[PDB]
From a paper:
The T4 bacteriophage gp41 helicase and gp61 primase assemble into a primosome to couple DNA unwinding with RNA primer synthesis for DNA replication. The domain architecture of the gp41 helicase resembles the bacterial DnaB helicase13,14 with an NTD and a RecA-like CTD that are connected by a linking helix (LH). The gp61 primase is composed of an N-terminal ZBD and a C-terminal RPD that are linked by an 18-residue flexible loop. Here we report a series of cryo-EM structures of T4 primosome assembly intermediates.
Author numbering:
A (entry chain E), C (entry chain F), D (entry chain A): 1 to 432
B (entry chain G): 3 to 341
E (entry chain D): 1 to 87
DNA sequence: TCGGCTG
RNA sequence: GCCGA
DNA sequence: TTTTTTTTTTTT
């Protein structure tokens, strides 16, 4: 890819602005490529700008080489084109080429060092290092990654850091005062959050409640039904939005006239967004399938989801790991990391629920250790709530949400808070 | 294991099988036979996939048709239980005693026996007219004219061979071929290759040896001072100063002289893993191997470079002299070049 | 000189008694020499003595070799004879040959490693280390010597012990006097320190507290975040060193004018270093990547690190074990080894943080048999701490440090102590 | 192998007197070997003495041999040498050859028997054995062993057992009259012993002292330490050996001159053993390791130990147990069993320490029931000494040692004893 | 029509954005076409975009298959070319 | 239409 | 089975 | 070598 490297050095400023800091004549070859890069280096040294093909030819004419080298360099020069390919692929590929050639150079150097070492001191060459320099010579050749960024400074970049503080565009509100209060502006994009609860305690209920709350806030929500069907999930969403008890829905207490009226009234609102719900067979969808669904959505409809809700992470099937390749801890943590990567790619708050081992399915409190699946999930995640319900809570219709893992804010300011869950409406009500 | 008893019992238990052939080369003992497990093919009677290799530390029967590879004892158990018990008993019987097979270590070889004096039905290339079809073909080959005194043209190649080695062909059908005489160190021809003409000859493009002990290296008599370059084609060697070419499917380092200064110049194919195997076996011996990893040309052989990419011999020589690596240095280029 | 080495291994006793334990079958060519050494080693294992030539012939006769191998071994043994020479040249020449043939084998190994690395996925095999491991192997080969120190030999090694008595290593002091007291003045330079804890209990909090203290102590600090953005870690440091709560920063309670004033008041302080925060994606950085970052920091920013602080040890790429190849224990142990090697190389007091097992979560006490990803960390680490803020320490706004692994002093002197962790300021205070 | 066997029959006295009773004329061959052994047997029968080479040649001169047999026997006789091979290998190899040839003869005999059986009974050989005796014949094949020593045979080794009794070939003294009084001669080889530290006793100190006392008696000792550094353990050893207080070593009251003088004075004494301190990470050392360490010490430092003191049993690791814990009954039981197996297989005394329960802590009297690791350790520990320190004994500078379990002797003979512990000197002295 | 399918997979964003999610390796052949699609899929996984011809040549150079397969893939890539077509 | 080819 | 004629 | 479910067992 040396030809590509030189072509994009000559006919691109962005590439030259990020790969010229890491470039040595020892990388390319001992043939025409070496002399061509030497010409480029000389031209940029004498006049601090990238040359042109005419300028390169003039430099080649002025420079002195043998006839074979002259012809080879001229032929290579004639084989240069703009070819405006992708920038990310270009920089990654040239970084790979640099690393491989650096490894080759270091290995050849240590081989020459050993060959000199075997020679008698009278015969051997003093210029080369001693054998003791073999290790470092390798590691310096393993530290040539393409990265010009040193990062923050805390002293030379305080104004930019304050500006970054002023950019609250990452936060997303919750439509609930208590959640935003305990998350300091709500959840953030590409930030995995887990609302774990026991079986039949309200995981998918809470996820659909969050979907409805985000829908009433104008976002675009993608509800990934891992267990239920599309119609059932949409029925729960209607129970939250159209404010009609889920049962009533099945008992005909809402006439089609009233249903149509409520749906049209909600359509008339300009603050309402779009909500798309996709059902998936158990163990048959993950970040790869999710991105395929993302592309299909963005093509078929002008829909860019701002929230991604997963019905249950455990139901998902890992991308690289097969269906049951390894134990639960490895595969579930892999699923969690893949989902967090998908969220940070699409810059969307990724909500999901988790199950609790049998030790806490009837406990007044559930701790972080009571994660039925991998313990890596309460490590790959950010804002973890736990939903607890007892006989008293069921009588009071108040699920208790415990701030089990809080990356956003202080995990202990309001650790346990009572929610006003109305199971009939699939809705959460803050308590004042 | 006990390889000699394995070979003996394999010969005993495979001689009666159809299409049996005891292929015994000076270092290899193999048996060709129609595999009883599969039967090979009715058309492929002579193309019998049943093979036995006893040259290894163990005797293995492998058939590529049914993909049946097994130790000789397994075959004896599955097919010759009486012979199986005989073998399994006698292996233990001689297991306790010391191996005596080294006692009758004799060499049945002989010195130059069929020294080639003259070539009937052959006219040397430099003796031929400039408009001869073979001359035009070698002009397409772009061989330097001065070396044309080393190649002959024939039209009676089966007749020539049967005049040298009678009984090779039941029919002396006239066949034009490029006769390349392979000489010894002292300069006398010990074999000759009937190089195919046109795109390909009808059948049997093989180097005919005057005798089994004849040399397989071309141009040894023309070796001068300096490093010796070993190639794969005698015509390719004709483009190389101090360039010899091994002629045969077997590559023995011992028979190749100039251990101090022999340089292996092989093909320019990073693929074809057999080439990689050859390179690896050469470098494991710590030999001097040339590497095409930095070759500006991407052809297969040096003559291919010259004909297709317009390479010149001086460029070839300077690349070879600058691209000789040994030991770990060679292994580096081998590793990077292979893929 | 393999023939001479074998001859003096057979026909000599003092030579054997001096050189045998270091000899190995890997130090000989694949021809007759290796098989002869195999027979000799087998006999020595079976009878605890050097065999005679007749014994070697007997073993060769009762061996499974090829005709070529048998002939070669017999010829070599027949060539063995006692050459009367000095017992000073033989030992040194044997050591030279063993080092030379160790280096050849090592080099061949790194070539194989590179070949494996260049292979595509699936097709590439395993049981072979990653390219990043190449220097470490080259370090082992250069260390081969016939003077092996296995353990402290009382009445034999008493000079070194007295030197260790009278002399003490240089300590990089902490700003908390409790850590100095439990480390007898501070942390030694070439060390890998880890601050273990539970999830979301103050791993990064403790690392940032140490970073702020070391920045206030004038050292040069590098904070490599793998789970947080550069802005988040820099915000933690700002909260620690400006006495402004994170709630104040997020809510904007402090004005930008006051922020700039505090930044200038800190910059005008002479006894202040430079802290630089660099972020890599989870699993996107290794020890080689950290070395490249150090190179650019020394070149681009002219900053020489003193305190490297990595956010999460268990997230970093192995740097020597291909990604997703081995188990968790091997991968994390290799990560710890690579980080400690980098710390020793750059003479920087490295800090990291490891995650305890699910059993230790919400438990009043932890120990070594609680490390989640790998229990090999205490073997590799040089100073490890724990955080036990489970139920009531947070209610009391305090902490607890177990001092799990302490190579600086006696861990069973101040094993458990209370630290006033202030979460809003992201700092540690002393209860005294 | 036949040549070596015949040569060492002709030219040796010990090898002949050891291996002649198990040699038969059918063991060798049907040719030169058989005839040569026939000559040897004839000569040893007619004259009760091993023939000389010229005597064997004379026997060849006067005997019934065919021309080819005569030539073969003469050549083999001339091919007999007086090579001085070692003894153990010669015995083992001739035994192996004899057993292999006996197996071949028995197999040939049973095969010929089966061949004879499948014949018309009218035409058969009467002398051939019947088929039903085939299992017996093979038994006679396997009833061939030059040295028949399998286990200790009562009524057949009463003299050797009495010699072991009188010689005290198992005991190893303690340099303390009290311990030898309570152990009938001290600890025994191939045994494990444990010190049960109570409420703050210092498991290291006792093992430290015994380590010393064992050192002063000339025994090779190896203190594998876990919770301490090699320098710290060696410093305690110095405190016990040089009469220098441990804190005085830290302060520097004792100077280099006095230290080196005392060290050289101890070196002058010929009754001083060697102590090898080796450190291992806490929990990173199981019994199998110790085996490799012993192999390395024997091979490299020629150090063959008779005392192996491991710092702490609970801190150790089980040889093959995946789950590790700081204090678990199964782990301590496995560790005790593996360490005792190591002691038995090494023919060495092994010492370790262990902790007891709080009931043993508060009460001066400690019962085997009042043991943290009871049933487990008591089962595999040959000796168990409960070391208890009380405030009154602290004032009197003593400790109450109680013989909790003595496989060596009666428990109640001298159970409780006051020991003169000096913590500063880390020394144990007797009480008048 | 595998050549056409690949040509519009590379030189057409509209065609790719529709057909790609359903496309899979087992749909083309056991020869050059499968290897070309494998290279395309690997590049897509690496960069979430369609590679150019130069990128495919780079990937082909850094590949592992035999000379026959390499020649086939190079021939196919050389034969890849956008043509005026309808969606 | 032939021979030679690893597992 | 793949390669060479 | 961890890790998680479940069951069974056992010790304190
Ligand atoms: N159609 C419905 N009508 C009334 N109550 C319902 C209905 N569906 C669910 N619930 C109640 O909602 C709670 C659990 O429902 P879901 O949230 O759908 O289950 P989940 O949270 O997904 O957890 P699991 O383990 O998958 S059942 C229980 O209290 C149910 O009684
Ligand atoms: N913005 C914030 N404001 C106040 N407290 C916070 C904030 N963010 C985090 N915390 C607190 O920080 C504590 C520990 O957070 P971390 O720094 O992430 O510790 P941690 O062990 O690194 O967690 P990890 O990295 O997810 S394992 C939590 O208990 C929170 O209460
Ligand atoms: Mg559900
Ligand atoms: Mg954190
Ligand atoms: Zn077959």
């Amino acid at each position: 890819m040396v030809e590509i490297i030189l072509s994009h050095l000559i006919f691109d400023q962005a590439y030259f602005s990020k790969v010229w800091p890491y470039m040595d004549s020892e990388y390319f070859e001992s043939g025409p490529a070496k002399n061509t890069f030497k010409l480029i280096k000389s031209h940029v040294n004498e006049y601090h700008s990238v040359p042109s093909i005419n300028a390169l030819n003039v430099a080649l004419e002025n420079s002195s080489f043998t006839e074979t080298e002259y012809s080879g360099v001229k032929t290579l020069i004639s084989k240069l084109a703009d070819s405006p390919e992708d920038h990310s692929w270009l920089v990654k590929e040239t970084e790979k080429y640099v690393q491989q050639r650096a490894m080759f150079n270091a290995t050849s150097k240590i081989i020459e060092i050993q060959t000199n070492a075997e020679l008698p001191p009278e015969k051997r060459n003093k210029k080369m290092p001693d054998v003791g320099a073999i290790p470092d010579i390798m590691r310096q050749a393993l530290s040539i990654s393409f990265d010009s960024y040193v990062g923050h400074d805390w002293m030379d970049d305080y104004e930019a850091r304050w500006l970054s503080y002023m950019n609250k565009a990452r936060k997303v509100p919750f439509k609930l005062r208590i959640l935003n209060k305990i998350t300091k502006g709500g959840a953030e994009t590409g930030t995995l959050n887990v609302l774990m609860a026991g079986v039949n305690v309200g995981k998918s209920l809470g996820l659909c409640s969050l979907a409805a709350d985000y829908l009433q806030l104008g976002h675009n929500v993608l509800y990934i039904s891992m267990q239920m069907a599309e119609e059932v999930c949409a029925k729960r969403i209607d129970a939250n939005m159209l404010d009609v008890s889920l049962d009533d829905i099945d008992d005909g207490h809402i006439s089609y006239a009233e249903y149509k009226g409520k749906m049209e009234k909600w359509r008339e609102k300009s603050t309402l967004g779009r909500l798309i719900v996709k059902q998936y067979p158990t163990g048959g969808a993950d970040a790869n399938t999710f991105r395929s669904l993302l592309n299909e959505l963005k093509l078929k409809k002008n829909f860019v989801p701002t929230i991604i809700i997963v019905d249950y992470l455990g139901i998902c099937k890992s991308c690289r790991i097969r269906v049951y390749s390894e134990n639960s801890y490895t595969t579930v943590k892999a699923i969690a990391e893949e989902l967090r990567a998908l969220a940070v790619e699409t810059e969307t708050v990724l909500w999901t629920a988790a199950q609790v081992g049998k030790q806490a399915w009837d406990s007044s409190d559930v701790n972080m250790s009571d994660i039925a699946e991998s313990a890596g999930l309460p490590a790959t995640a950010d804002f973890m709530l736990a939903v607890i319900e007892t006989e008293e809570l069921a009588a009071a219709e108040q699920q208790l949400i415990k701030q089990i893992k809080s990356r956003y804010g202080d995990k202990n300011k309001w650790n346990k808070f009572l929610m006003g869950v109305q199971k009939g409406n699939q809705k959460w009500v803050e308590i004042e | 294991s006990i390889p000699w008893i394995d070979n003996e019992f394999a010969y005993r238990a495979l001689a009666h099988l159809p299409k049996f052939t005891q292929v015994n080369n000076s270092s290899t003992f193999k048996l060709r036979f129609r595999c009883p497990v599969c039967g090979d093919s009715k058309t492929d009677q002579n193309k019998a996939r049943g093979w036995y290799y006893g040259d290894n530390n163990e005797g293995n029967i492998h058939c590529y048709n049914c993909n049946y590879h097994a130790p000789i004892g397994i075959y004896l158990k599955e097919f010759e239980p009486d012979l199986y018990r005989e073998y399994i008993f006698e292996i233990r019987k001689e297991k306790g005693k010391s191996r005596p097979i080294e006692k009758p270590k004799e060499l049945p070889k002989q010195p130059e026996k069929k020294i080639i004096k003259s070539l009937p039905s052959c006219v040397r290339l430099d003796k031929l007219a400039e408009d001869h079809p073979i001359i035009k073909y070698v002009k397409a080959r772009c061989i330097p004219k001065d070396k044309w005194k080393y190649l002959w043209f024939t039209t009676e190649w089966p007749k020539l061979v049967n005049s040298i080695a009678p009984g090779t062909y039941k029919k002396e059908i006239s066949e034009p071929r490029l006769v390349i005489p392979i000489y010894n160190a002292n300069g006398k021809a010990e074999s000759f290759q009937g190089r195919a003409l046109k795109k390909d000859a009808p059948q049997k493009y093989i180097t005919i040896e005057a005798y089994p002990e004849a040399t397989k290296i071309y141009g040894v008599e023309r070796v001068k001072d300096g490093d010796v370059y070993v190639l794969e084609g005698p015509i390719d060697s004709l483009f190389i100063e101090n360039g010899i070419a091994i002629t045969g499917g077997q590559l023995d380092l011992e028979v190749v002289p100039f251990k101090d200064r022999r340089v292996w110049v092989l093909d320019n194919e990073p693929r074809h893993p057999d080439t990689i195997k050859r390179m690896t076996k050469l470098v494991d011996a710590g030999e001097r191997v040339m590497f095409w990893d930095k070759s500006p040309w991407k052809s297969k052989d040096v003559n291919d470079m010259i004909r297709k990419e317009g390479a010149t011999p001086e460029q070839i020589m300077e690349y070879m002299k600058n691209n000789i690596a040994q030991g770990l240095m060679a292994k580096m280029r081998l590793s990077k070049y292979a893929k």
